[model samples]
Target chain A: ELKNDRYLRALLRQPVDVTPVWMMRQAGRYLPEYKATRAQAGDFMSLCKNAELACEVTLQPLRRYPLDAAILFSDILTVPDAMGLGLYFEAGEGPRFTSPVTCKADVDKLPIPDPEDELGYVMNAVRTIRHELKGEVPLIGFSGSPWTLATYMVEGGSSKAFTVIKKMMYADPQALHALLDKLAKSVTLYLNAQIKAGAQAVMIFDTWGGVLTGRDYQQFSLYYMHKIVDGLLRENDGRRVPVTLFTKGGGQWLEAMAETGCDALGLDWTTDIADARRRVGNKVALQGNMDPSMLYAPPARIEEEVATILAGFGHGEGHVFNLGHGIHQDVPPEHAGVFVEAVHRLSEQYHR
Target chain B: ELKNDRYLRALLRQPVDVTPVWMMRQAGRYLPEYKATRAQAGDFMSLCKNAELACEVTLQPLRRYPLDAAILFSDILTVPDAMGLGLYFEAGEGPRFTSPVTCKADVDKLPIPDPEDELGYVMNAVRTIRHELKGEVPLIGFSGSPWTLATYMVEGGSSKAFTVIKKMMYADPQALHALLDKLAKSVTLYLNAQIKAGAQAVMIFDTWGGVLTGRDYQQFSLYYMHKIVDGLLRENDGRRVPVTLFTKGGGQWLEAMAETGCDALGLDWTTDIADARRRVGNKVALQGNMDPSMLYAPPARIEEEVATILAGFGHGEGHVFNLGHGIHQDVPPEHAGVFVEAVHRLSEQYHR
Candidate 1:
C-alpha cells in the first residue's frame, strides 16, 4: 500500500508533513521528453490514443522535478467526443465539434452514454497508466464541470468571455438549466468511471462557470457544480479521494464553493492566494493563486514570484503552491524546471 | 447657480433630497436629436470639435430627461491628440491614434501641454453647455483616468483586452510609469480647465483598470487615478465639484476606492447597489448598478428590473439612478423611457 501522501491528507484537513505540491498540467508541453514522446506519437490525438505513450509523457515531469501527483494525460472534451460529436483540432485553430448544441432540439436529443461502455477509451487509458505507474504518484482525474461543458457544447468552441452562453443564460434560463443538469449527470458518471479505472483524486474544472453574473452563476453554474461533487463516490476503496472545485473568476463566490465541501479551492491570477486562504481559512486547503505568465519570466524572477506567492499564503501548513491556471503552449522547457524547482524551494524555505 | 444638486451633496456626504444623477455620455448617440445633430457634424470627431454643437448635444438629454447634471461632450483621447497622436475614428472600427507611445524613447519624449490651448475644444464646449443650460441642471466634466488614457496611448487604439498593453506593462513597467506621469499631469490640467470653465462636478472613467491584475492595478492604475484626484481642485466658486471614479469589475476594491476621497463611486452591474452603499455607507454617493441589457426585456420586465435596483439600494438619499453601464445600441427607446420613469416613481415612493 502507498503512503497517504500529505497533499491528499492536507486537502482532507488531516495532519501533513508539509504543504503538498502539484500543478495544473504539470505533465505538459513544457517538458522536453513530453514533447519528444508527443512528436514520436505523430499527432496530438495519437499520443492520447496510446496508453503507454500517455504514461511516458505523464511521468516526464516527475523525472525532472518532485511533483506529488500526476493528472491523467487527457483533455476534458473527450467525454463529448465519445458521444460521437467527432472532436477535431483544426489546423492553426482551436478544437471544434462537427455540430454545436445551439438549440433546444439538439440539446434534448444529445446522448447520455454509459461512461464504462461509451467512453472506454478514456477509462482504459486511466487503467493502463495507473497500472504502469503502480502508485508511484497519485493520479488526479477531472471533468469539465457541467456548466463549463455546456458552454463549449452550446457555442461549439472555446470562448473569450462566454457572452453567447450568457445570452442563453439570461434569456432562457430554463433551457440552460435543463442542459446543465444533463451534463452534470453525465460528468458524475464519467469522473466516477475514471476513479473505478484508477484515479485517486478528482477535480472539476468549471473554467467558464465563473464568467456568469452573480445571480445567474448561483442558478446556472455553482448549483450544478455542487451537484456533481455531491453525487460522486468519495472513497473508491480504502483510499480517501479528496475533491477540488476550480472555477476561474469564481473568486467572488469563494464562500459558496467551499460550502460544497470540496477539499480545496483553486484560484486564478485575479486574487491573492494568501487572501483566499484567509477568507476561506482552514475551511479548505487553498491549492493555487499564481499568475501563469510568471513562468514566461526568467528563473530568478520565477523564484522571486513563487516565493512572493508562498509568503502571501504565509509560512504555514496549508498552502499548495501552483500556477493560477493551466500551462500554455511554447513555454520554454527549462522555465518549467525553474517553476517546479521554485515551488519546491519556496515551500521548503517557508516550511522550515 | 444650479444649486448643489443631490449628486454633488451626496459625494460630500451631505443631506440630500435624492441621489445625484448623471449618465456616462449623457449626450450620446441614442437620442433622435443627437442622431440628427451628428448627421450635420459629418463624423463623431466633428461633433466633439464644434463647441456650439457639442454644447447643443450636451444639453439634449436634460431637455428630454430630468437628469441631475450634464457632462461635457468630449472624447477621452483629446490629451493624447494634444500629445500629437492625431486621434480619429475609423468607420465601424472605433477610436485610433496616428502615433502610439510604445517604448522608453517615446515615453521619454511625451509632452504635457497647457490644457487651455491644447484642449480648448473641450473647455469651450463646457462653457457653452453651462451657459445654455442656464442653471437648469448642473454641468459635469470628465477625463479618462490616467491608466485608461495610457491604454489607448500605448496600444494606439481600443483593444479587445489590451494584451499588447499588458505585455508592455509586465515587460517594461518603468516606461509605463513614465508615460502615465505625462498623462496624469495632462489630465489634472485638463480636468481643472473644465472645472474653471463651469463644470459643477467631474468624474474619472477608469474603464480599462479592470483589465489589470490586483497587484498591477494598485501600482499602474489606481495609484495614478488617485494621484490625478489629489492633483485636482476639489472646489470651484466656493462650491464643491464632486469627483466620481468608476472602475468596471472593481467590486472587490470598493473599500480602497472609497478611501480615495472621491465624491462618488460609479459601480458596474455585477455589484449590488445596496451592498455598495453599505460598504461606503454614507462616505460618498453611489451612482448606478443596473445592466444596460435589462432594457432589452419587455416593458413590464424593464419596470420590474428598475424597481428592484431602486429597492436593492434601499432608502438612500445618496444613490443616483442610472444604467450600470452605457445604454447599448439596440435598446428600445420606449423601454428606456419606462426605466427613467420607473426610477422617478419608485425613488419617490421610497423617499416619501
Candidate 2:
C-alpha cells in the first residue's frame, strides 16, 4: 500500500494491496444505531449542531461495519448555516433554510464565516473524531460545491427543478457570478480549516455540476472547483492528504474532472469504473461507482453487483471498489456487508 | 428555402424565412384549444387514438402562432402501447402502463407493430395531419429514444428518480439491452413510417439522456439513438429530409453529438448558444434554447432573454431561436406572443 490508509492511497491510483472502500453518506439514516442516536439528539439539526452527537453518529456506522473511513456526519448545507442561515429539518421536510440569498443585496450580505470561528462546532467534531480514530481509519471532511450551495441559498430550499436559481444564471450574469465567487471562497476556507482541524482528506460535492451544459460547466462549475483545489492546504502531515471532487451527473467529463488536479474523482454508479479508468488512467485516483440502490436488493443481488463492479475495472492498479452513489436511507445493513465481502473476494484474485 | 420544405431545409442549415420553430410539447394543455378539444375527445388516449382529433390539436398551436413547423401531436410511450401494454392517463396521475417488462421473458416478448395494424392509429393521424396542413408549414415527427421508452415500459409509469429502471440497468444490463433493442427497432420504423406518411422532418427526443453519466449515455442512450438515426431514410424528397437529435443536460458532449451526423442539434437554455455554435462550427444547424420559463416573465424580461440568446450566439447564420425547454404549463399565452415577436425583432438583425 502507498500509505497508512488504503482508501487514500488507492484513490491516488498508486499501488495498493486490495481495493480500499468507503461508502458515501455511510453515517446516514440507514443504520439502526444512527437512527437511535438521531432520536437522542431530539432533531436532525441538533444532532448536527452538537459536536459530540455529530461525532457519535459519524463513528456509529464505523463501529457496525468494517468501513475504511469516516466522513464527518454533517450535511452539505452546514456551510450555508455557518453563514447564519438557520438550517432546519421539519419532521419530513428534508432540509430548509429560513434565510436565502435571492437579491444581489442578500448575496452581498451573506456572512462568509471564518471556518474556525463561525463553524467551531463542525471543526470541534472533526478534531474529536480524528483524535478518537487515531490511526485506525482516516476521517474525511467535505462541503457542497459553490454552484450547488448557491442553488439552495438562492432558492431558499429544495427545488422541484432549480427554476428560481437558473433564471438568475441566465438573466443576470454578474449577480450569479458574484454569488458563485462568494460560495467558492467560503467553501475553500471551510475545507482548509477542516484540514487544520485534523481532517486527513477533503472532498467538494458539486452535486449540481452535471446540471450545466458543456462550456457552462467549464466556466461555471470547474472554473471555481479549480480555484478551490488550487487554494487548499495540500498536506495534513508528512503525509500527502488527497482531495476528491464529485459532481453529480458529471460522468461524461472524466478527462475534464481529472484535469482539476484534485488527487481523485468520485464517480456515481452511472459510470462504468473500467471506462473511467481507461479515460483518466494514472492521472488521478478514482473512487466509487456501484449503483447504490442495489443495496435494497437481497444479499445475492448486492454480491453480484459488487463483484461485477470489482471485475469491471478489471485486475487493475488504482481501483477502489465503492457504490456508484450514496447508500440509500433505510437499506438493510447486511447488503452493505455483502458488498464489502464481494470486494474482498474479487480483489483477492486481482492481488494474486 | 432549399428543397423538401423549409422545416427540413432549415435543419440542414439552409436559409429559411425564419428559424423553423416548434416547442417540444406544443400540442398539449398549454393552449385553450387543446383543452377544448380534449373535452370533446373524452380523454388523452381517446384524443390520441382518433386520427381526426390528433390532427386537430397537431395544428392547434400552429393556428395560434406563426410557427414554421407542426410536430405530430403524439406521445412518446405509444410504441409500448402497441405491444399490448395497457397505457392509461389516470385522473391525477400523468401516464402509466399495466404491464412492465422487468424480466428477460417480457423483454423478449415485446412485439414490433406492423405500422399498418397495431400502430395504425398513430400512422393514420400522421396522414390526416399532412392532408390538413396542405403543406402550409411542414410537419415534424418524433419518438422517445429507446432507453427513455424502455424506462417506462419496464418501470410501468413515470419514474421518480428512475430507481427501478436504473436498478435494472445496473443489476441486469443484458436484460436492459434486450429491451433497448426492441425499442430501437420500433422507433426506427415508427419515425420512418411518419416520414412516409407526411413528416418532412423527424427528431428523436432523448430528454433523459443527460441523466446518465457520459459512459452510460454513450452505451445505453446515444448508441441506440445513433442506430435509429442511421436506419432512417436519408432522402424524403428531391430535397434531403433532415433529422435533429436533442438530449437535455447533454452540454458536455456537443462535440460528440455533432459527430453523430444528424443534421443539427438542440440546445437547452443553460448551454451558451454561442459556444455550441463555435464548438460544432458549421457541422449542422442549431435549434432551440431559450428556457421555456422565460415565457412566464413579463414581456420586457422575455424580450431581454431573447436578445441575450441572440447576442450570445452573435449574428449567426445557422442559429435557430426557440426555448431551451418545452413551454411551461401555466405560462401566460400572451407571453408566448411577446417571445415570438422578440425572436422576430431581435433575430431580424442576425438574418439581415
Candidate 3:
C-alpha cells in the first residue's frame, strides 16, 4: 500500500524502474532544519524521545530530495540507555554511559528491557513516521548489533583503540558472551516491536565488527546478529519486512554475512560494488558502496561518482543506492540532492 | 656477515628452522626502559634526533626478547617535518603540523628534502643501531607511503575522518596527486639512504590508504606506492633489501598490493593470514596479523591466539609473525615477552 515501494522492492531483489536511494544518516546535522529542530528539543536524547520532533526530522530529508524510504530518527544506543546505563553526550563529544558494565557481576545484574515498556519512545517514533509518510515510502527501524552495543557499554563510551572491551573479551570471554546474549535478546524484542508497530524494514548496524579478526568477528559479532535475525519478525502488514546487516569495515566477510539469512547487506565504500555483487551473487540485495565524503565534491564530480557506482553494480536488480557510510555534517545539502537525482537518472540504463 | 638472517630469509619465503617474529612497535612506550630513555632525551623528536638514544631504545626490546628483527625508531612524519611543515607534538596528543597544505600553492612549495642533508639524524640513528647490533638481526627502515604522508600533511595532524584530504581528492585531485608525487620522490630518497646506512629491509606504512574507496585506493594510494617501489634500491651491502607494503584495514586489496612488486605485505589483525596467503599465493611473503589488543589477554589466552595464527599459515616459508598493528602503550611488558616467546616456541611444530 506504499506509493513508492522501490526501497522495499529493491531490498527484496524485485524489479524496479530505478535504483532506490536513501542515506544512512539522511536526517542528520548536515541539514539546517535538523539543527533548528535539535535546538528546540534542547539535546540529542530529548529529540530522539520526542515522537513528534523525531517524526519531523525524519521527514526533513524526504522533503528536500526524492528519497526512497524514511528511517525513524533515533540513536543506536536507545536500547542500552533503557538498560539503565544512563547514556549522556558531552557538549561536543560522543555518547557515554554513567554506569559501564565492567565485569561478570555487572553482566549478571543487567536487565533485558521490554521495547514497549522501556524503549517505547523509539516504537512511538516509528509509528509517527509511518503515519506521516502516508504510505509514500516504507519506514525503516534499526538497532546496534549486540557486539557493537557491548563495545560502548564496556568501553563506557566511544573508544579509539577499544583496548578496554578487548581486554575483557580476551580475558573474560564468558562475561562478554553473557552480555552479548542479553543484548541479542533485547535487540530482537526491540526490532520485532518496531516491525509490529509499522516498520517496513530493519537494519542491524554492526559498526565495530570490522575491528575484530575474521574468526573473532564470526564468533563475537556475526553469531549474535544471526541469532537476532532468527528472532526477528520477517513479515509485517502482509509484506516482507527486509533485514539489512551493515558492518562498517567488513568487506572481507561478505559471504559469511550473506549466510546469515538477512535480506540485504550494507557495504562500505572500501569494497567495490562489482566485486561484492560477484561475491554474494544472488543470495542477498546490496545497499551502498559510495564514499559519503564524495558529497564534498562539485556537483558534476558527485554525479560522476554516482555514475561510476551505478555502473559498478551494472544491470542489477538487487542494488540499493546509498553512501558507503553515514553522511558527514559539513556536506552541502544541495550536493546530497545531486547524488539522489543522479542515482535515479543514471541508474535507469543499467536497470533496463 | 649477519649472525641471524631468519627475518630476511622468511621475507624471501625461504626455509627456516622456526618462524621469525617481531611486533610493530616493539621499542615503544610499553617498555619501562623505553620510557626511561625517552625521559632522558627530553621529548619525542629530541629522542629521534639523538642517535645514541634512538639506538639505545632500538636495542632495548631485543635485549628483553628474542626478536628476529629491529625497526628504525624514527617517526613517519619526519620527512614532512624536514619539508618545513614544523611538526610538533602536544603533551599527550598526536603530531600536528604548523603549516597545513590547504591548496595547490602549498603543494607546489613542498621541497623534497635530501636524506643526507635534512634527514641526517634518521640515517644516523639507523647506522648507529646497525653498528650496535653487530649483525644480531636484520634492521628495518620505513617511510610513510605517499598517500599516508599526504593525509597528515594536508589535514595538519591525526584525523578521525580525513575529510580535508578526501575533499581535495574528490574536488581537485590534480593538487593532491602533485603532493603525492613529491612525497613519493622524497620517500624513495629517504629509504634509499636508510639502505645505504645499513637498513636490511624497508616498509611503506600506508596507514590511511584503507580509508579510500577501492578505485580511489588504487589511483591515489597504490599507484604512488607502485611508483616508489619501482624507484627503490632493491639491494645493499651484498644483501637483498626486501620491501613490505602494509595498508592497515586493507585486507580486501592484498592482491593489488602484492602486484606492486613489493617482497611482502603487512596484514592487519582483521584479515585471516591463511586466506591472505592463499590470495597472494607466494607472490609475496606475509607479515603480521595478530590483533595488537590480544596482548591485553592472560598469557595462556595470548598463547592460544599465537597458535591460531601460526596454524593459519601452516607449513609456511613466507610467514613473518607480527602483531597486526602497533602495540598499545599500556600493555604489560611481560605480556609482550609472552607473545614473542610463544611464537618462537609454538611455531617450531609448523616449520618441522
Candidate 4:
C-alpha cells in the first residue's frame, strides 16, 4: 500500500489535502547528480538500458524534493528503437534513426515489439523503481504518442519544419496512417507492460502534435492517442492506473482530448488552466502548467507564479501542479525545490 | 492609381471582389529567380542593402503569381542591427549580434537609429519596390515587435528556449522594460519612415510573444505593441496605413490582440479562423490560418486545405488568404502558384 496517494487521487479528481506536484522530465539533466550518472554511464541510451542506473536516476529527484510521484526514467524513443529503426544521438543534436521509414513498403515491413520481450529493460527499470519507492508514491510510466514517434522514424532525426513527414502526411496519408496505426498498437502494449511491471500510472507525450493542422491533429494524432487510452489497463492491484495525454502546443483541442477518456490532460504554459477547466468542464483532471522557464526566476517570483496558477485553478480536486513542459537542463535545482514547496505551502489554503 | 485595393479593403473589414491572396515571405528563397538574384548579391544582407536587387526579388513573385500585395523585401532585425548590435549571419545559422544586451548599462547605451540614416537601405527598397510595382498592388512594410527584437538582441541570436531574455525578464524586469521601451520608440519611428517612403500597409511580427505567460505577454509584448499602434502614422497619402499584428503561436490571445485597435490580425495554423472570428466578433479582419507545409502536398490537397480554410471563414468580407507562416524555402515554386490560383479561383463564391 502507498504511504501517499495525493498524486493518484488528484489524477482521478478525488479530494486531496493539497494539490500534488511533479515536474515533467523530473529525472533529467537539471540535476548535477543526473549529469554525473550520465557521465558514468558514458552515454544516454546506456543509462536507459541499465535498469539499476535508470532506477537510481529516477529516485534522485525525489531525494532532492518532496515530489508527489516518481516516474520511471526512460526515453520516449525506446519503442521506435526497438522496432529496429536503430536510434542514436549525435553530440549536440536530438535523437536520430539509422533507418527511417519512408514508403508504404517500409510501414509494411515494420514489427510491433512485445514490450516484455524487446523492451524488457524499460519494464525492469519500472519494477526496480517501484520496489525502491517502498510504497512511498506512485511510479508513472510513459511513451511517445504515435504521431510523435512516427516523426522521428520518418524524419530520421530532429526537424525544424518537419517537411519530410508532412510531405508524407499530405501526399500519402494512407502510408502515414499505417505507420501511426502500428505505433498505436506498439505503444498500447508497451505501456500495458509497464503497468504490469508495477507502474501505478501512465502518460503519453505527443511532443510534435501541435505542428499539425486541427483536422489532421484529430485524425492523425488524437485518434491514435484515443486508441492507446482505450487499450490501456484502467485498473491494477485494486487501484486505477490513470492515463494522461499531453500534446506540447495542443492548447486548442482540450475538449476533443478530454473526450478520449483520458484521466488527465497536461497543459503547456500557453494554455490558461482556469479556461482549460471551463472548456473541459470537470471531465478530466488538469496537470501542469507553470512555464519551466519560471525556475530561472528568484524563489519569491517562483512562489508568486505558483500562487497565480493555484488561484487560476481555484479550489480544485483535479489540479496537479507541474511545469508546462520539461524542466530546462540549466535550471537551478534549488529553485525546483522552491517551486515544489510553494505549491504545497500556498495551495493548502484553497483545499481547506 | 493602384489596380487592386482588395488587400487593403479586406484588412479594413470592407467588402472585396474575392479574397486577396499573398504570402508572408512571397519573395523568399523558394523561387529559382530569387536564388539567382541572391547569388548575384553574394550574401543575404547584401541583397537587402542593394535597392535595385531587393526590388528585383520583390517583384519576381508578383510576375509569377496574381498576389494582391507586395511586401517590402527587408529583414526584421534591421532596426536592432542599426542600433549598433553589429548583426551578421553565420553559415547555416540565424542572425547573431556581436554585442548583446546583458545588463542595464548595455540597455542604457543602446541608440535608437534614425530610420533614414542607418536603415535607409530598407526604406530605399520600400520606395523602389513601390515605384516599380506600377500601382499593380499595395506594398507592405514591417518591423519586429519590441519583445521579439529584444529576444534577438538579448540572446544575441535565434534561441530555442529564449532563456537569456526570459532570465532578464524575471530577474530584472525594469532593465528589460527599459530596453523594450527604447525598442518600441525605435520601431514606431522606423515604421513611420517606411510609410513616408511609400509603404501602403505595415505589420508587426511579435514572433516570440506567444512564449510568455498571459500576464507577462500583456505587460511585456502587447503593451509595447499597443504603444506602437498609438504612435503609428495611421493615414498616409490619402490612404489608411492598416496595421496587422502577427504573433506566431498567439492563437489563444486573439481577443487581447484585437483590443489593440489594429486593423487586422494574422493567424497561424494552430488557430481556427471560424472560432477566431466568433471570439473577436468581427472587430478586425482575419488573415491566414493555413499550415505552410500544405504547399508540399499535391495541387489537389493544397486546394482542399484552401477550400477548408475559406469555408471556415464563411461568407467573409474580412478575409485575406495567406499561409499561416512563411513559406518553407524548399517548397516547389509551382506549388505556390497553385495555392495562389486556388485561393483566387475558389474564393469567388463567398464574395458573390
The candidate scoring highest on TM-score is 4
Which candidate tops DockQ? 3
lDDT for model 2, please.
Answer: 0.79
Comparison by DockQ, 1 against 4, better one: 4
iRMSD per prediction, in order: 2.9, 4.4, 0.9, 1.1
Candidate 3's error at B264, in angstroms?
Answer: 1.0
Off by over 4 Å in 1: A1-6, A25-64, A73-106, A113-134, A152-167, A296-298, A328-332, A349-352, B1-4, B20-65, B72-75, B81-102, B113-118, B124-135, B152-172, B211-215
Candidate 3: CAPRI quality band: high
Candidate 2 per-residue lDDT, tens place, A16-116, comes to 77777788878877888888989988988888878888998888877777777778988788888877877777876557878877779878887788888
Q: After superposition, how far is residue A328 of candidate 4 from its true place, in Å?
A: 1.4
Chain A, candidate 4, TM-score of: 0.99
CA lDDT, candidate 3, residue B291: 88
Tens-digit lDDT string for candidate 4 (B1-352): 6789999999999998889999989888899899899999998988889999999999999999989998988898988889887899775887999899999999999998999998989999988888899999999999999999999999998988898998899889999999999999999999999999999999999998988888889999999999999999899989998999999888888989999979999998888888998887479999888988889999998998889999979687998998878988889999999999999999999988
Compose the digit string of candidate 1's lDDT tens values, residues A1-352.
4553766776676655555667788777767677789889888877777788887888777777777777888888877776667678664567777787776776688888788786777787788878866767778888888888888887677765454565566566677787888898898999999989998888898887655557767788888889888888889868878798888867878888888867788887777677788888678887877766666666787788777777877566666667667675546767777877777655766566
| lDDT score, candidate 4, position A48 | 92
Question: Tens digit of lDDT per residue, candidate 3, span B8-30?
Answer: 98999998989999999888999
Q: Clashing residue pairs in candidate 4, if any?
A: none
- Candidate 3 structure quality by residue, lDDT tens digits, A131-225: 89999999999999999999999998989889988888888899999999999999999999999988999999999999998888999999999
User: Candidate 1: TM-score?
Assistant: 0.85
Model 2 CAPRI quality: acceptable
* Residue B113 C-alpha lDDT in model 3: 96
